[PDB]
Each structure stands twice: as C-alpha cells, then as structure tokens.
Design an enzyme around this catalytic site. Structure first.
Site, PDB file in Angstrom:
ATOM      1  N   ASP A   1      -6.872  88.044 137.148  1.00  0.00           N
ATOM      2  CA  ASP A   1      -6.718  86.741 136.507  1.00  0.00           C
ATOM      3  C   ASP A   1      -5.902  85.781 137.376  1.00  0.00           C
ATOM      4  O   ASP A   1      -5.020  85.078 136.879  1.00  0.00           O
ATOM      5  CB  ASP A   1      -6.067  86.904 135.129  1.00  0.00           C
ATOM      6  CG  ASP A   1      -6.261  85.688 134.238  1.00  0.00           C
ATOM      7  OD1 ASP A   1      -7.305  85.012 134.363  1.00  0.00           O
ATOM      8  OD2 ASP A   1      -5.369  85.410 133.409  1.00  0.00           O
TER       9      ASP A   1
HETATM   10  C1  LIG Z   1      -9.483  87.807 132.987  1.00  0.00           C
HETATM   11  O1  LIG Z   1      -9.558  89.016 132.211  1.00  0.00           O
HETATM   12  C2  LIG Z   1     -10.434  90.019 132.607  1.00  0.00           C
HETATM   13  C3  LIG Z   1     -11.144  89.959 133.795  1.00  0.00           C
HETATM   14  C4  LIG Z   1     -12.063  90.986 134.235  1.00  0.00           C
HETATM   15  N1  LIG Z   1     -12.756  90.859 135.453  1.00  0.00           N
HETATM   16  C5  LIG Z   1     -13.588  91.854 135.791  1.00  0.00           C
HETATM   17  N2  LIG Z   1     -13.847  93.013 135.057  1.00  0.00           N
HETATM   18  C6  LIG Z   1     -13.197  93.171 133.869  1.00  0.00           C
HETATM   19  N3  LIG Z   1     -13.460  94.364 133.109  1.00  0.00           N
HETATM   20  C7  LIG Z   1     -14.408  95.478 133.328  1.00  0.00           C
HETATM   21  C8  LIG Z   1     -14.453  96.583 132.458  1.00  0.00           C
HETATM   22  C9  LIG Z   1     -15.339  97.645 132.645  1.00  0.00           C
HETATM   23  C10 LIG Z   1     -16.245  97.689 133.705  1.00  0.00           C
HETATM   24  F1  LIG Z   1     -17.047  98.682 133.850  1.00  0.00           F
HETATM   25  C11 LIG Z   1     -16.218  96.595 134.588  1.00  0.00           C
HETATM   26 CL1  LIG Z   1     -17.332  96.609 135.927  1.00  0.00          CL
HETATM   27  C12 LIG Z   1     -15.331  95.539 134.395  1.00  0.00           C
HETATM   28  C13 LIG Z   1     -12.247  92.124 133.401  1.00  0.00           C
HETATM   29  C14 LIG Z   1     -11.491  92.157 132.171  1.00  0.00           C
HETATM   30  C15 LIG Z   1     -10.599  91.171 131.730  1.00  0.00           C
HETATM   31  O2  LIG Z   1      -9.927  91.326 130.514  1.00  0.00           O
HETATM   32  C16 LIG Z   1      -9.775  92.642 129.921  1.00  0.00           C
HETATM   33  C17 LIG Z   1      -8.864  92.659 128.661  1.00  0.00           C
HETATM   34  C18 LIG Z   1      -7.501  91.985 128.987  1.00  0.00           C
HETATM   35  N4  LIG Z   1      -6.900  91.548 127.681  1.00  0.00           N
HETATM   36  C19 LIG Z   1      -5.493  91.123 127.962  1.00  0.00           C
HETATM   37  C20 LIG Z   1      -4.819  90.900 126.606  1.00  0.00           C
HETATM   38  O3  LIG Z   1      -5.764  91.036 125.567  1.00  0.00           O
HETATM   39  C21 LIG Z   1      -6.286  92.353 125.504  1.00  0.00           C
HETATM   40  C22 LIG Z   1      -6.752  92.788 126.890  1.00  0.00           C
END
Ligand SMILES: COc1cc2ncnc(Nc3ccc(F)c(Cl)c3)c2cc1OCCCN1CCOCC1
Ligand SMILES: COc1cc2ncnc(Nc3ccc(F)c(Cl)c3)c2cc1OCCCN1CCOCC1
Lengths: 124, 306
Positions: free
Chosen positions: B147
């Site tokens: 982020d």
């Molecule tokens: C800017 O926020 C993200 C960017 C992301 N950029 C790339 N990938 C993410 N997740 C993800 C998850 C599983 C997968 F297999 C792959 Cl390829 C990617 C991402 C998850 C993101 O957020 C995940 C959850 C974060 N929040 C933070 C507070 O609220 C609850 C959890």
C-alpha cells in the site's frame, strides 16, 4: 489565527545561580493549551525542557532538569513562567515557549516562532 | 461516537493517555492524538472497535510487523499495543489500541503548502522512502507493504520522512502456476480488486493469466509511481486506465530538463514484468550515486518542508 509568543528574563548568569524566565501569549486560547519551554543548545539543536497541563494538574520536566527547574502559569494574564536554579553550563541555550508537548526523545511538537531569550551560564 | 471519544483518558499499561484530537478518520478505526499525563509525551493512538475477526487478526498482524520494523529512522516508531476482550469491553465491542510516535503530519500536506520541488528535495524524499522499504524487504521473512503511496508518507518532528500504515502488509508471495485453475485466478482477482483502488493496481494483479509473480516487486512499481508524482505533480496512472497499466503505457514529459536525472529510474521501476524491475537494493545504490554526484546527503533532514 495569529500566534504571538514573547519570551524574556534571560541573560548572563553564573554556575549554580538562578534565573526566572517569562512569556506572554495572545491570538489563541492560553487556557486550552499545554505549554512547554524548549531550548536551542549550540551544537545540539532543539530539545524539550519542561511542560505544564492546561489546568496545572500536572507538571513535566526532562531528566536533566528535574529537581532544579520549576514551571508555572497564570491563565488570567496569559503568562508562562520558568524558575531555574542550580544552573549548569549545560543549561546554556536559547529558550522559547511553545504550545503542546513533545514526542520520542524530548523532541518538541511545535518548532518556535518567537525570537526567544538567551540564557548564558558563564563564570564571568 | 468516535468523535465524542475526545477528552477521555485511556490507560495503556503504565501510560495514562488523554485523547486530545482526531488525526484521521478511517471509518473502521479513528486515529487520535494522545498525551500521557505522567510524562507529557505525545503519541498517535489508533483505536479499533470491531468484532469481525478478519479486522481483528489484521490489526494483530499489523502490530507484529511494527515491532519487527522498530528502531528504523524512516519507519514510524512503535510504542505499545493492547486489546480488550469483547466480554470485558465497556461497549461490548472488542477494543484494540495501537500506539505509535507522533509526527508533524502527512507529506502531502507539507507538499502543496510549498514553485516546484528541487532535485535535492525529491532526492531526499524518495531516498528516505526507499530506505524504509529496503528495511522491510531485508526481514526474515521479507515484509511487503503493498500500500505504498504518498498519503502513507509522514514528516517527522525532526523533518525526516516516516513510513506509517502497515495494515495491508504481508509476508506471503504468490506465484501463479500451471496448477492454478481458471476459477482460482477468478477468485483471487475478486479478492484483490475489493481490497485495492484502480490507480494503484499493478500489472501482475490485473492480469492473472500472465503468470507474473506477485510479491516484493509490487513495492518497486509503487515507488516508481511515487518518484513520477514527486517530479511531475501527477500520478502516471491517475485516471485508472487498466489498459495502460498492464501495457505500461505512460508518458514522461517530453521536454522536461529539470528532473532529467530521474528518467532512468522511472523507466526502470515501471517495468510491466516484475522480473525486469530493479530490486530495492539496486534502487538505493543508484540513488546513492546520484546523491554522491550532486554533493548531497540523502539522509539529511528536509528543511524545505519544515
Ligand atoms: C492495499 O491492500 C491490499 C493490496 C493487495 N495487493 C495485492 N494482493 C493482495 N492480496 C492477495 C491475496 C491472495 C492472493 F493469492 C493474491 Cl495473488 C493476492 C492485496 C491485499 C490488500 O488488502 C488485504 C487486507 C488488508 N486489510 C487491512 C485492514 O483491513 C483488513 C485487512
Ligand atoms: C498531526 O498529523 C498527523 C500525525 C501522525 N503521526 C503519526 N501517525 C499518523 N497516522 C497513522 C497511520 C496509521 C496508523 F496505524 C497509526 Cl496508529 C497512525 C499521523 C497522522 C496525522 O494526520 C493524519 C492525516 C489525515 N488527514 C486528515 C485530514 O484530512 C487529510 C487527511
């Protein structure tokens, strides 16, 4: 808003001696402000020295000045005061009064706007 | 009310914190300015009231990350944290308290307050940012921020840059495989788009049939966009055209002579293939040579912003 802070009371003082600083405020509500004294020591920069709550319920100092220094205030006249005693050569600097307190290792939140008053702890 | 929490005194271990102001409103967790009545030291306090265990384990992982990254001059300093059981809470909402050092404010704030930025200013800003990221990638296992934006860059009381929000971070890398079924690619993209915003999306998280690795190289792309924004006052993919992101179709200002020294880095960080992007170590090295050839100490406080 306009913040007008004016320090005075400094000068040439001897080691082990005493001194009394003062500061007048205007353009904001002095009764709703944590007030602090900060100093600018040559070769060191700015550092927080002492602080007092808006209702004088709590007084705070830095470790190197506890027991020797005393801060106070008078909300009726918008005045801040610093009573210094047992002055060491390390207490030499340019003293300001600012709003709010500090963070981390005695690093002030508000970086002085006034001219400040000079405090020199010299043996003549 | 999250706004009527101002004036309250919160006890956090040995600390007795008076809530003075509201620094940020995140909808899920407000951030307050707090001051200890026993020392006068001021802090930033994040307060989460939620029952949803996804947010709960998120802020729990958020805390562990900050402890690992503690002590670094370009990462906001962790102070303390505490959680209150749903059973024992005052409102019957699970309470989580997160306390860090207090900074002067957001970089964005001190940017628009001040012609354009000099190359020495952009150099210090970007270098101190990349040092923070470098420290995250150096951990075992590595920490990926995911982020990285100018909104998450703070200006310290010393005048240096501090990276702040670690809620979106992770330590898991994802490598789209031959064994990834067509629907697995479908489910993953949904999960990413619901947790991301169009203008900040990377080519590897838009096209999940490219088999591009999804890990550390994400941050480099984000850093690439930051450097672009620091120079040309706009995001290189602001409008959010997903066609231009995946194809890496952006445009450096034709006749820009001021920030010519940065053209090499911008082009090299905004590579569509993550395997072609520079590593964080290579980025820092090139910055250090730019700083050396410009007689500038990149770690020095940025007085122009103060
Ligand atoms: C800017 O926020 C993200 C960017 C992301 N950029 C790339 N990938 C993410 N997740 C993800 C998850 C599983 C997968 F297999 C792959 Cl390829 C990617 C991402 C998850 C993101 O957020 C995940 C959850 C974060 N929040 C933070 C507070 O609220 C609850 C959890
Ligand atoms: C006095 O200014 C700040 C100092 C700060 N010092 C430390 N941390 C901040 N943010 C933050 C970010 C994430 C966290 F998890 C926690 Cl605990 C704190 C800070 C945020 C501050 O301001 C918040 C910026 C949000 N502004 C709110 C007003 O409109 C523009 C967006």
């Amino acid at each position: 808003g306009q913040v007008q802070l004016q320090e005075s009371g400094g000068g040439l003082v001897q080691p082990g001696g005493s001194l009394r600083l003062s500061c007048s405020a205007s353009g904001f509500k002095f009764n709703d402000s944590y007030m602090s004294w900060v100093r600018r020591v040559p070769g060191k920069g700015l550092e927080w020295v002492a602080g007092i709550w808006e209702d004088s319920s709590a007084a705070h100092y830095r470790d190197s000045v506890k027991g020797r220094f005393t801060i106070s205030r008078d909300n009726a006249k918008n005045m801040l005061y610093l009573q210094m005693s047992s002055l060491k050569s390390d207490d030499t600097g340019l003293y300001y009064c600012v709003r709010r307190g500090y963070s981390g290792d005695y690093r002030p939140i508000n970086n002085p706007s006034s001219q400040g008053t000079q405090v020199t702890v010299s043996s003549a | 009310s999250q706004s009527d929490f101002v004036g309250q005194t919160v006890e956090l271990g040995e600390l007795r914190l008076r809530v003075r102001r509201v620094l940020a409103e995140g909808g899920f967790a407000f951030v307050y300015e707090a001051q200890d009545v026993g020392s006068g030291r001021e802090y930033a306090l994040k307060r989460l009231l939620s029952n949803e265990e996804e947010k709960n384990r998120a802020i729990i992982q958020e805390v562990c990350f900050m402890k690992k990254l503690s002590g670094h001059p370009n990462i906001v300093q962790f102070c303390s944290a505490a959680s209150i059981g749903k059973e024992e809470s005052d409102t019957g909402q699970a309470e989580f308290l997160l306390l860090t050092e207090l900074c002067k404010g957001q970089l964005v704030e001190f940017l628009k307050k001040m012609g354009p930025l000099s190359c020495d200013t952009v150099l210090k800003i970007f270098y101190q940012t990349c040092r923070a990221v470098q420290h995250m990638h150096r951990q075992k296992p590595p920490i990926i921020h995911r982020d990285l934006k100018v909104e998450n860059l703070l200006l310290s009381n010393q005048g240096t840059i501090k990276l702040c929000d670690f809620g979106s971070a992770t330590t898991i890398s994802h490598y789209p495989d031959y064994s990834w079924s067509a629907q697995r690619r479908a489910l993953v993209e949904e999960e990413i788009t619901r947790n991301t915003t169009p203008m900040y999306r990377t080519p590897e998280i838009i096209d999940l049939y490219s088999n591009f690795p999804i890990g550390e190289k994400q941050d480099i792309w984000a850093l690439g966009c930051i450097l672009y924004l620091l120079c040309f006052r706009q995001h290189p993919f602001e409008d959010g055209a997903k066609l231009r992101i995946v194809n890496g179709k952006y445009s450096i200002p034709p006749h820009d002579t001021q920030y010519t020294v940065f053209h090499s880095l911008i082009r090299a960080m905004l590579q569509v293939n993550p395997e072609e992007r520079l590593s964080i170590a290579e980025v820092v090295h090139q910055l250090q040579e730019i700083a050396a050839a410009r007689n500038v100490n990149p770690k020095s406080p940025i007085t122009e912003l103060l």
